[model samples]
Target chain A: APQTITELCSEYRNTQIYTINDKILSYTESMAGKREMVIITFKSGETFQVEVPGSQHIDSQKKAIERMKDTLRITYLTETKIDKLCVWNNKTPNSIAAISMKN
Target chain B: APQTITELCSEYRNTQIYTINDKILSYTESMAGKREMVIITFKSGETFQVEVPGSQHIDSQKKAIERMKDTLRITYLTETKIDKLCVWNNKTPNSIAAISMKN
Candidate 1:
């Protein structure tokens, strides 16, 4: 859907988004108390994470993201398991998302 | 739940959260294509927003945030309708959120 991470860079001054392509290098999730954490890396050398606190909506949110991976499997990549790439800075601590997984 | 915006500042580098007391100064939402955009301002001079793309989790997420306003009415604010504050960079585009809405 998009071309470069640099294009998404101007979205926020304090946070930055990175570019990614091909396979997702990693995706990790953990929890402590009511907070949940996620870490993901891309083939293009971008690494990111998210920290989700215990909130009324956290359970649903977690389910949503977990479901996201399945969608990426079908609509996102043309050649790889993960495509349409860029890391958004919007998740709590290690929140990483994509902007254009398909070409 | 927290003390100051500075406490939440390190959540991300690109975005900064502002402190607030009293009522939320403003909240605005608009739509473009399949994306929804939001803007909100606090009395403490902090303004933030979020852009929600058409996604599976969007409806639930929007409902969640809207409901969050109600929670703030009781649990978040002590002296003000909105208190316990900080900004989180985890939302997309104009994405802005609070760390602690009451003190």
Candidate 2:
């Protein structure tokens, strides 16, 4: 079987950060079977929704999310794009941030 | 002049809720000038990135979001679609959820 999103992070935390180059249009999260799922949109009319099993706490403890008012800060977060995400698992710990960045 | 996102929500929190009909592909957030932004994607290869000025707290206090293992819970949240979003704002209080629902 293929490795889960959790496995990909642990095995390759050093190289799996996705990139964003467009204007974000909207954002939201939904309930999942064993975890939470997040959804977002862009001004160009493109949409990307993914689930981060490692960042489930964000859903439980988070209170109110202030809607966006300005453009995205790609320079601050990183300009690189995350690859091979389908093979990554979100159940593992610290996998959410791992896939997007390195800390 | 047009109304700001902050203005839109305060004026029309009762309306303006978008819908999700595709699979969530990915989830991420970044920094703006004075607030945070969210980015998501669907399995259909559609990318939707938006800024939630009302749900800024979610980005601040959230951590460790677990990866999704199944489909989205549309029925659980609501089956209705969010219309006139570009007109609705995201800075008003309780505006984030309001845009998606009427609670």
Candidate 3:
């Protein structure tokens, strides 16, 4: 049998975490029957069962969000022509955005 | 050729206007290809074909909005329920609204 979300979080705290199911990655605690807490479904499809006051992490909250955004970027690039268009048009563009970007 | 939003407003000023389609009640003027000026979609699926600078009625402009709110309260009871929420459920224990009682 597959592990429940609650079980997964309990078993994987501060440990190397991974999942195979996409639907499971997007699930909330209500689906897992946990009360008074929620699961943040990251774009990379990783679920973080964050505690109400705080959550255990190897990094600050901001770093976790950045990691998730990186995941989204990679997944989006792998799944569509968006990456090609972005690199060919936006990333290397002489457009307003490229010129206006500070860094 | 269907009547345009601009045409409808021009025809129904201070008139007993009625409409049959619920979808029409939620449409914006941009969808009708009109520039500058938005149409307010009323809840009763009946729009107030009124002017912005000066909409006319038997009572004050505040009264006109009151009428529209009532229409919303009546139509799609589910929508009205959440959007209106009995306006404080004004019975019994009399808990003061944090917003209303604020100084």
Q: Candidates' DockQ values?
A: 0.02, 0.03, 0.01
Q: In model 3, which regions exceed 4 Å deviation?
A: A1-103, B1-61, B73-103
Order of all candidates by DockQ, from best down to worst? 2, 1, 3
Docking class of 1: incorrect
* Reference-based TM-score, model 1: 0.33
Which candidate number maximizes TM-score?
Answer: 1
In candidate 1, stretches whose alpha carbon ends up further than 4 angstroms from where it belongs are A1-103, B1-8, B43-46, B53-80, B88-94
lDDT of 1: 0.42
Candidate achieving higher DockQ, 2 or 3: 2
lDDT of 3 at A62: 29
Candidate 3 residues B24-97, lDDT tens each? 22211110101111123345532222122123224464444334333432342222222211111221211111
Name the lDDT value of residue A26 in candidate 2: 55
User: Model 2, B7-99: lDDT tens per residue?
Assistant: 554553443434444333444443212223333444444333333334443654333121110011221122233222222233332122222
> Clashing pairs in model 3?
none
List all candidate RMSDs to the true structure.
Answer: 17.2, 15.8, 21.9
Off by over 4 Å in 2: A1-103, B1-15, B31-35, B43-103
